[PDB]
Amino acid sequence: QVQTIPMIRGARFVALFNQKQPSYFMNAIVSLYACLNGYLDDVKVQYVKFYEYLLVHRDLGIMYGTAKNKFFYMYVQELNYLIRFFTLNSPILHGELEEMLKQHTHLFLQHYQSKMNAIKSEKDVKALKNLLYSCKRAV
């Protein structure tokens, strides 16, 4: 099974399209941009939904104290119209967007995916499945 770059991103895109409730414009576009730029290449397919949830409803950088962005924090819903106005590729919002994405990816791979890859206990497996079900149904 040869997995080139287009194949990896396509699979991640397909997983992201799984939704139950409508997504706010800022959250959806940000997640799509992250997947398009390859930030989810290291993230396993089954964990994409959990990765997306942490990006929208959580902030790893603030949690682990490795964040320095001035404005581009995803909890600021007011940024949606600013993104709608200029772009996600504008120099005004491009640098901070990359920085927070890189920090979020680095923290997620370091803390969460590493632990999820080291689960063998049947009870833990059941807990992980329940977590994934909840994340899939909620962003």
Add this chain to the structure above:
Amino acid sequence: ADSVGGQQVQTIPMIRGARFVALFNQKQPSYFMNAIVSLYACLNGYLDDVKVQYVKFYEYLLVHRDLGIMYGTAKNKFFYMYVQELNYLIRFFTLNSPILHGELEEMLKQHTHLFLQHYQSKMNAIKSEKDVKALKNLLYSCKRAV
């Protein structure tokens, strides 16, 4: 279903299914006693050694003839196929009953042994231009005789 090529293997279920599918070929209706007896014989394997082509002839001898009486070997007291009034006894008492089960198996075993010994042995030894035709005509007649 797997017999379309592959040289179908003759297991006991197949060895008995073919006989069943060959006994169902008939022209006139069969009296209950004759039909039930023949099915029972094929069900317990008494026709496993009988070729599929000779099944009708085997049934005809069982019904309209009595090999045991012909060769003076029959030992049953009442259970004979020429007693057409046994039908209602069989209806009241199933063939799998001690009253009739013992004699039924004895008659079937004796009839099967005599048929293989005398008739089928000669059939497999037919080598001629007229005997083969006579055998073929005989089988066809027995096909629509019972």
Add this chain to the structure above:
Amino acid sequence: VDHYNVAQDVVQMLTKYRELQDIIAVLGIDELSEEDKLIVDRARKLVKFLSQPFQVAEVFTGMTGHYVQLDDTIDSFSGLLMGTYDQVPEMAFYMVGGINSVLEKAKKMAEEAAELEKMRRAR
């Protein structure tokens, strides 16, 4: 939520059991992995556990009927999927209601087996 998760897990296991049936037919049972061979045992227990004796047939079948509660069914299947009841014999799930019935049937089967073995040793 627990009901939904259990039901989906059961469906997934049954679907996987079908594909493994084909695979074992292709090559054989031993050819499957440890993981897959554990899944072919749980699935068979599930198929047997979904049967049930109905009280309406308490007369013509002779077996006492069962009325399994909703919560009991969810818990029973949830435990089975995890692997808690991996020691119970497969036939203990056949025509039974709930999990307690499974345990009772298994004990009776074990007692019957012990008695038969004990009788055999005598002779």
Add this chain to the structure above:
Amino acid sequence: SGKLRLYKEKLEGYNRFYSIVKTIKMVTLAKYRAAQGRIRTRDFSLRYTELAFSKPQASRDAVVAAKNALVYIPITTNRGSCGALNSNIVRCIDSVVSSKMVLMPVGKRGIDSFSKLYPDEFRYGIINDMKESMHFGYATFVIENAYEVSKDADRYQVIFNRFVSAGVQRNAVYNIPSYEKWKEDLADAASSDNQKNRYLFANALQNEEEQLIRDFFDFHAALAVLNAVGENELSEQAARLVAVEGQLTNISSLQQRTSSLYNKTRQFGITAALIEILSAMSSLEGNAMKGVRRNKFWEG
């Protein structure tokens, strides 16, 4: 209606086709399971055969300087439906066509395919019934015919299929240099540090008498042939199971496409008829009319 039944007959044929192809899958399944033992028991007979013939040489110098017949013995299956094995082998042979190329293919597909494509290069083939197990005698028959095809042959090549796994069937090559070139190389390995791994082997064979060496050469050549045919059979059955599954699914898709057209046709046929009857009922009613009503209208 004939049109509706035309689809029904068409779908009737596909049903029988599925059953027959299903039967093929089972037949090949048994032979696949029987031949699956080779997977376990392979990879140990040909150990010193490697030293005898394993020479990772360039693909150009070998064929460019051919002054004598280069004999090829591609392995091909008797029956089709195997897959792309035969096609790839032909591509592998077409890529090495030369003036001195002689072909002695194996299998009916090999004889028929290579007879027409390369007439002068094809001399004759060998056909074996898949009734007994692939044994030494069959390999000896391949070699003896190969020598008589071209005794003064620079090399004899065998192109077969290696069954890496249930879904991986590669194309493999056994090159066998004739006695003169082999003994010359065997002489250099013994006398020099070059061919180090063959140094002890070359001296060991050199000590013994010639007839033994000739027997040794023929014996190991037969083993290489035996391995190729054995592997080619296992790859054949594995490939057929994969191919047959593809045919089953293709024949299932057609059954689902012709059934819809059959169920769509009956619905249209019923509607068209009833409309047509009910348009000839409206016409009769419309053309007809009630005449002057002769009754005591005043009496009311």
